[PDB]
């Protein structure tokens, strides 16, 4: 879902192609094979905060 500022204007035919293949590829993958590395890093950075704040643990 991009929000345009004659972007999409200039890139209105290859722009339309790469949107239906993002609309296909996203929706089945969902942070799965695009994250992986990313949702190892979330429960690691956010894990470290949590033991010292938070309440206690």
Do not use: C, H, Y
């Not at 035919?13 to 890093?41: H, P, V």
């Amino acid at each position: 879902t991009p929000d345009v500022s004659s972007a999409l204007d200039k890139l209105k035919e290859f722009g339309n192609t790469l949107e239906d293949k993002a609309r296909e590829l996203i929706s089945r993958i969902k942070q799965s094979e695009l994250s992986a590395k990313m949702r190892e890093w979330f429960s690691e950075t956010f894990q470290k905060v949590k033991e010292k704040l938070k309440i206690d643990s």
